[PDB]
Amino acid sequence: SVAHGLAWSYYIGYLRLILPELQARIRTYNQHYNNLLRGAVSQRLYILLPLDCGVPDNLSMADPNIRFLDKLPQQTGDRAGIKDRVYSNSIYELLENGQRAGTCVLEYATPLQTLFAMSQYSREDRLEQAKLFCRTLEDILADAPESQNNCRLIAYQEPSSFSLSQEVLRHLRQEE
Amino acid sequence: SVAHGLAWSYYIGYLRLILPELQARIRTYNQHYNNLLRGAVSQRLYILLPLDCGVPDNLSMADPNIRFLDKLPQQTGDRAGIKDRVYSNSIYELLENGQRAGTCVLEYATPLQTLFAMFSREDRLEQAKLFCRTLEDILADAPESQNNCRLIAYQEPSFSLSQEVLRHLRQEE
Numbered sequence: 001s002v003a004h005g006l007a008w009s010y011y012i013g014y015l016r017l018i019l020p021e022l023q024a025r026i027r028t029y030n031q032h033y034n035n036l037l038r039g040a041v042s043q044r045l046y047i048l049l050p051l052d053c054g055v056p057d058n059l060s061m062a063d064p065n066i067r068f069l070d071k072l073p074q075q076t077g078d079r080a081g082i083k084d085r086v087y088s089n090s091i092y093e094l095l096e097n098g099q100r101a102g103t104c105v106l107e108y109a110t111p112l113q114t115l116f117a118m119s120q121y122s123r124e125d126r127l128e129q130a131k132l133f134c135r136t137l138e139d140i141l142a143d144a145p146e147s148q149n150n151c152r153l154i155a156y157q158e159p160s161s162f163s164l165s166q167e168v169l170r171h172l173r174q175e176e
Numbered sequence: 177s178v179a180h181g182l183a184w185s186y187y188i189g190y191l192r193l194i195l196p197e198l199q200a201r202i203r204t205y206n207q208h209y210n211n212l213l214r215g216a217v218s219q220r221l222y223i224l225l226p227l228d229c230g231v232p233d234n235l236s237m238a239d240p241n242i243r244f245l246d247k248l249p250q251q252t253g254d255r256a257g258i259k260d261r262v263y264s265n266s267i268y269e270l271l272e273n274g275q276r277a278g279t280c281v282l283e284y285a286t287p288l289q290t291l292f293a294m295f296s297r298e299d300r301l302e303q304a305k306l307f308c309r310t311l312e313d314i315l316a317d318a319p320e321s322q323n324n325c326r327l328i329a330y331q332e333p334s335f336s337l338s339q340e341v342l343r344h345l346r347q348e349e
């Protein structure tokens with residue numbers, strides 16, 4: 001199946017490489033006193049898994065209560081003949097009543113965009129593939145030594161009375 | 177199937193985004209970065225598709241006649257909540273009798289590493305062939321593919337990766 005392969009490549013080509021280095025990058029960021037005064041960055045990578053596979057490029061677009069703060073110090077690695085392939089991650093402030101409620105490294109699971117592009121014009125099959133992607137990735141990370149309470153999957157369906165920031169803050173507070 | 181999905185994601189998540197900007201980046205390198213006496217970097221992205229899915233991280237490992245020259249000027253784009261996701265590509269000199277015979281932007285199709293890490297050698301060879309077949313069909317139909325991308329699919333049996341790439345470079349001129 002398509003989703004089986006996308007989930008395994010998402011682990012093998014990304015999460016396997018960055019999760020071992022994530023604690024050290026977030027720690028490096030938090031150890032700068034002027035960063036920490038704004039607020040401590042949470043110690044997990046938060047991965048948004050919208051089951052409708054709607055992956056916008058900007059999080060501020062999806063919810064203005066998700067505000068871009070800064071980038072993590074980037075990780076580099078030689079891979080498949082590309083010298084210094086760069087792994088960049090973005091830090092976001094989550095607003096509640098116009099005030100910062102939390103700070104975290106937050107992004108969409110990009111492979112869902114492939115499932116969406118494959119079937120924008122089948123919505124039932126896309127929902128099945130999205131669920132399979134999440135289920136498979138959950139099983140990989142459950143068994144993987146790189147996943148050590150440093151990664152949180154946030155799977156959701158939109159009901160347009162929805163708060164993405166509240167969904168993230170729900171998960172963020174549970175980990176604290 | 178796995179390879180069908182990997183091929184489509186390789187187009188949608190990479191080739192679709194970088195191939196429209198590749199001519200401008202190679203032109204920028206040839207006009208501003210390339211040393212006065214060095215041969216021009218060729219105008220196409222050369223993608224190595226080893227059917228055994230053996231994808232080393234360094235090209236000098238697979239053949240020492242593939243020498244790293246420089247990196248292209250990097251491309252950035254906001255994507256899936258990551259601000260300024262960076263697309264970096266590496267330029268290689270291909271040596272013949274110790275001297276440069278061509279220069280090109282060269283890399284492996286990284287998704288083959290996923291097929292390798294993942295189902296016997298025979299099944300893996302079938303998935304690699306399906307990956308190549310599917311990617312060929314996508315690029316045949318795609319407006320971003322305008323003679324600016326070259327797929328180099330090969331089976332190793334005494335084999336020269338540099339000669340295989342130089343064969344394709346010479347066909348384009």
Ligand SMILES: O=[P@]1(S)OC[C@H]2O[C@@H]3[C@H](F)[C@@H]2O[P@](=O)(S)OC[C@H]2O[C@H]([C@H](F)[C@@H]2O1)n1cnc2c(ncnc21)NC/C=C/CNc1ncnc2c1ncn23
Nearest residue numbers: 009010013014086087110111185186189190262263286287
């Ligand atoms: O196994 P791979 S290396 O990655 C799978 C998956 O893992 C995830 C993401 F979700 C991926 O899917 P996608 O974005 S639709 O790309 C599908 C394939 O196209 C190919 C490459 F073959 C991809 O397959 N591809 C994509 N980007 C990219 C690239 N340089 C060269 N080839 C690239 N530079 C930009 C950023 C590179 C590092 N930074 C990353 N940041 C975030 N997520 C990341 C990164 N690298 C991986 N991933």
